[PDB]
Amino acid sequence: RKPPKGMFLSQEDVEAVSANATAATTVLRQLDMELVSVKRQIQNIKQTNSALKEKLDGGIEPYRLPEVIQKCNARWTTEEQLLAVQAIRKYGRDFQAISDVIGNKSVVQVKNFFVNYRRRFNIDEVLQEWEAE
Amino acid sequence: PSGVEGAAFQSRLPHDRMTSQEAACFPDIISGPQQTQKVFLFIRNRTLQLWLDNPKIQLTFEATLQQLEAPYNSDTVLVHRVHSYLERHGLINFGIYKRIKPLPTKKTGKVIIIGSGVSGLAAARQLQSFGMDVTLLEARDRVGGRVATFRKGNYVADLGAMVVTGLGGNPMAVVSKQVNMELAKIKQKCPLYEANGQAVPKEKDEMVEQEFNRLLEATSYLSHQLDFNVLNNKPVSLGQALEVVIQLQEKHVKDEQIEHWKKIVKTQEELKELLNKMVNLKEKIKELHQQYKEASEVKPPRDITAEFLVKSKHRDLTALCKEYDELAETQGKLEEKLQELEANPPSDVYLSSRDRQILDWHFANLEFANATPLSTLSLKHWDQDDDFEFTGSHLTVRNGYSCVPVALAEGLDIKLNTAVRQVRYTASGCEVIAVNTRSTSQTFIYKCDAVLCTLPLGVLKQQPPAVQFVPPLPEWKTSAVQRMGFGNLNKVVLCFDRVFWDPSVNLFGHVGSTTASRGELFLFWNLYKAPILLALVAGEAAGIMENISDDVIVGRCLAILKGIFGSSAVPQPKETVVSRWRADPWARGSYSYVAAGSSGNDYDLMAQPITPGPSIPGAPQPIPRLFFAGEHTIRNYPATVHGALLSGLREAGRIADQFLGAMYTL
Numbered sequence: 001r002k003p004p005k006g007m008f009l010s011q012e013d014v015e016a017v018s019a020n021a022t023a024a025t026t027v028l029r030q031l032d033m034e035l036v037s038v039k040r041q042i043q044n045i046k047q048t049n050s051a052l053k054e055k056l057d058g059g060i061e062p063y064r065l066p067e068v069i070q071k072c073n074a075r076w077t078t079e080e081q082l083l084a085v086q087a088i089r090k091y092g093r094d095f096q097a098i099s100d101v102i103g104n105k106s107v108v109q110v111k112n113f114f115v116n117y118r119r120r121f122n123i124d125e126v127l128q129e130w131e132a133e
Numbered sequence: 134p135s136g137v138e139g140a141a142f143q144s145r146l147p148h149d150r151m152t153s154q155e156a157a158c159f160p161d162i163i164s165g166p167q168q169t170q171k172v173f174l175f176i177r178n179r180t181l182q183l184w185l186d187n188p189k190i191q192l193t194f195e196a197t198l199q200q201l202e203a204p205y206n207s208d209t210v211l212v213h214r215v216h217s218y219l220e221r222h223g224l225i226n227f228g229i230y231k232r233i234k235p236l237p238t239k240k241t242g243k244v245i246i247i248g249s250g251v252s253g254l255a256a257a258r259q260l261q262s263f264g265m266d267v268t269l270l271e272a273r274d275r276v277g278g279r280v281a282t283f284r285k286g287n288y289v290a291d292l293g294a295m296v297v298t299g300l301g302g303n304p305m306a307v308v309s310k311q312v313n314m315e316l317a318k319i320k321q322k323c324p325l326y327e328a329n330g331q332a333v334p335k336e337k338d339e340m341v342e343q344e345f346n347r348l349l350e351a352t353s354y355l356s357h358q359l360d361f362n363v364l365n366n367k368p369v370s371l372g373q374a375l376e377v378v379i380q381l382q383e384k385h386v387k388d389e390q391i392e393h394w395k396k397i398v399k400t401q402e403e404l405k406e407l408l409n410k411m412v413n414l415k416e417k418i419k420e421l422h423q424q425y426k427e428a429s430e431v432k433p434p435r436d437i438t439a440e441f442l443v444k445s446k447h448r449d450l451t452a453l454c455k456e457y458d459e460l461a462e463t464q465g466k467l468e469e470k471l472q473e474l475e476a477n478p479p480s481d482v483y484l485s486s487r488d489r490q491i492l493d494w495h496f497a498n499l500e501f502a503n504a505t506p507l508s509t510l511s512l513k514h515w516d517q518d519d520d521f522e523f524t525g526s527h528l529t530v531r532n533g534y535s536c537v538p539v540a541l542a543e544g545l546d547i548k549l550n551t552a553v554r555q556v557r558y559t560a561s562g563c564e565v566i567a568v569n570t571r572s573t574s575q576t577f578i579y580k581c582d583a584v585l586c587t588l589p590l591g592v593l594k595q596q597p598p599a600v601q602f603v604p605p606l607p608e609w610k611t612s613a614v615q616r617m618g619f620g621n622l623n624k625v626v627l628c629f630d631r632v633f634w635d636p637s638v639n640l641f642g643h644v645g646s647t648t649a650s651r652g653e654l655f656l657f658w659n660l661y662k663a664p665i666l667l668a669l670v671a672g673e674a675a676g677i678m679e680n681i682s683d684d685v686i687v688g689r690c691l692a693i694l695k696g697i698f699g700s701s702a703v704p705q706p707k708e709t710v711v712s713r714w715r716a717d718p719w720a721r722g723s724y725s726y727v728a729a730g731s732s733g734n735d736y737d738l739m740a741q742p743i744t745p746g747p748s749i750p751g752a753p754q755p756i757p758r759l760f761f762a763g764e765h766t767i768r769n770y771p772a773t774v775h776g777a778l779l780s781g782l783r784e785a786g787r788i789a790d791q792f793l794g795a796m797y798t799l
């Protein structure tokens with residue numbers, strides 16, 4: 001009903017080999033010449049990848065910055081109100097990033113802040129500006 | 134099987150149903166109610182049993198009924214019909230039995246049998262036992278035909294048939310009880326040795342053999358499930374189908390590597406693209422650190438925008454320092470994946486030239502089995518008789534297979550050295566025209582009611598004809614003769630004074646250096662009590678080595694043997710014999726094979742007898758006068774001795790029925 005296992009005999013395949021006297025030898029050679037095509041291209045990409053690795057020597061380790069472990073706070077010093085209005089102008093509504101600029105405020109009351117001072121800090125107006133970019 | 138049901142199986146008959154033949158002799162029973170059939174069936178089965186468990190004496194109809202038990206011994210004529218049928222077609226009282234009822238004083242009808250091969254001898258013996266006058270004409274100075282046993286001193290080696298194929302359902306079993314054949318099993322073990330002379334590692338011997346067997350099953354699947362039996366208007370041979378399968382198995386090996394290395398490139402470029410992100414990110418992080426440092430360098434106390442700038446750049450840089458890390462997880466994950474695939478590369482080849490060489494030796498065995506190159510075998514039909522193979526170990530005849538034809542010849546009128554040259558068959562009867570082989574001027578005319586031709590298919594094939602038929606055989610018979618395949622297979626008998634091989638091995642191989650020479654001395658046989666090795670030449674090699682002297686051939690033997698056993702252990706052979714069956718004028722080959730474009734149906738054409746036209750015009754249609762036996766006339770058991778024998782039994786039945794009358798049909 002089906003071939004023995006390991007033997008591969010598709011209906012399609014036989015016609016390809018059967019169709020001409022030398023058809024099998026060509027079809028094999030096509031694959032044979034298409035395999036070198038692939039191995040030659042691994043060598044290419046492997047060499048390209050090796051270079052790209054040469055450049056990343058050092059990692060990013062001279063350029064890392066120490067983690068700022070900071071207990072969060074709920075009182076908005078005038079300072080960190082001002083950090084905020086700036087953070088909003090440079091980020092828009094990325095409420096997380098705006099939190100790590102500040103670093104004493106957690107993520108939520110940055111969300112809170114937006115409505116609280118919405119008129120005193122013209123956040124709408126500030127957010128329009130951010131949308132020019 | 135066991136009991137009466139075993140007797141039916143041992144006679145190649147289904148125990149629980151009636152065959153087409155006995156339907157034809159007993160159209161009343163098989164057309165009647167089931168009860169009787171089982172009666173008949175049991176009545177037949179016991180009779181076969183009685184014949185079988187003692188086949189050294191005639192099983193007479195009286196002794197049969199006498200030992201039946203009621204109700205089966207009540208229909209006195211159904212027994213007499215059953216026994217008669219069985220005796221007619223040689224299912225009982227065939228071979229060499231001591232006759233109780235002595236032969237009739239005067240005979241009936243005249244049959245000339247061409248050839249005293251086993252099929253000839255078998256019919257003659259049956260026809261004589263039916264009270265006919267039988268004479269056999271035989272071109273050689275010996276009986277047996279293609280059963281040919283070499284005998285010098287105590288050396289006994291067989292140039293013709295060597296093996297009995299297993300007694301389960303084999304008539305030769307019966308013959309072996311009536312004759313002293315010393316039968317010895319053939320142990321299936323077969324150690325290879327390649328062209329250098331060193332054994333094939335059991336790793337390989339096992340896996341190549343396994344591949345051969347699957348390549349076969351593969352061809353069978355192209356045949357039956359894909360109907361690949363015609364290619365550019367020509368029948369497909371086994372050989373082609375094998376090359377097709379091997380190519381599709383190489384093609385897959387290649388396709389398998391392509392998709393695998395195409396998995397390395399799909400991720401080597403996925404890597405390359407990642408590192409591009411990595412390298413670009415690192416540059417960005419080169420700038421941000423400088424920017425952060427410059428903003429950081431402005432010393433406090435600063436205004437809040439300059440404070441935003443440090444705080445901002447700082448977070449902006451820990452973010453980019455976050456992506457470059459989520460990316461380096463990914464670099465690590467692809468770096469192992471790339472390493473993984475490099476580590477499980479698929480099969481490098483399908484079969485190396487080392488391998489394909491050993492596979493070629495499995496093909497020479499197949500070419501031996503068929504006595505022909507595989508490019509000639511019908512893909513569809515070459516193995517069409519597999520279903521009827523007997524059960525049991527194969528055996529050899531240790532005292533020579535000749536003892537059987539020679540035994541069967543006892544009491545028969547054989548004219549040796551008598552080459553039939555013309556067969557004339559007409560409505561009134563037949564004349565067979567033979568010459569003496571020693572001096573061909575001496576001419577003989579033999580006149581007879583019927584001719585049984587057991588001329589080998591090669592003889593029948595010969596152009597110009599060794600034998601002329603008058604009138605010419607009808608084209609349906611001559612076409613079957615052309616279509617069929619008569620192959621070729623030759624032995625070299627090497628007689629030494631010292632046994633230097635593995636005497637626990639019956640057969641060991643030699644891998645042929647080339648595909649072309651794969652048949653050239655590829656297989657050796659230790660079957661005999663004397664120190665005799667026996668070497669095959671099959672396939673395309675058979676026809677070639679015919680044109681090469683024995684001294685060259687026994688050389689190439691000693692070379693192959695020395696390389697496998699060491700130059701010290703191989704003495705010179707004391708007696709040598711090299712068969713050349715394609716050249717032998719009374720064979721013109723070895724045995725039949727189902728050629729591409731043939732089928733097993735030609736084997737039935739071969740066996741179907743010739744009926745001459747009428748002498749007087751408008752006269753009533755005549756009796757058949759020309760009958761055919763021989764291993765090429767029995768489709769279910771071709772190319773074998775038990776095949777020959779069965780075919781001769783078959784004709785003596787058909788002939789006797791025609792000329793003595795079948796009285797068991799009422």
Ligand SMILES: O=C(Nc1ccccc1)c1cccc([C@H]2C[C@@H]2NC2CCC2)c1
Nearest residue numbers: 321323342345346347349350495498640
């Ligand atoms: O290969 C052989 N090995 C051998 C090798 C050397 C010496 C003898 C024997 C072989 C020989 C005879 C019959 C078969 C039967 C299974 C094959 N039919 C079908 C079912 C699997 C293919 C095999």
Ligand SMILES: O=C(Nc1ccccc1)c1cccc([C@H]2C[C@@H]2NC2CCC2)c1
Nearest residue numbers: 349495498499500501502516519520522
């Ligand atoms: O090489 C072969 N035989 C061989 C045996 C002994 C020594 C050498 C060689 C062989 C291989 C595959 C199939 C067959 C066909 C005939 C047998 N019919 C049988 C298989 C089950 C029905 C013979």
Ligand SMILES: O=C(Nc1ccccc1)c1cccc([C@H]2C[C@@H]2NC2CCC2)c1
Nearest residue numbers: 501502503515516725726727771772773
């Ligand atoms: O004449 C033969 N058959 C034949 C098959 C096809 C076409 C014509 C003729 C025959 C010749 C040599 C060896 C065998 C051995 C393998 C078979 N062994 C049996 C026990 C395993 C199956 C067969």
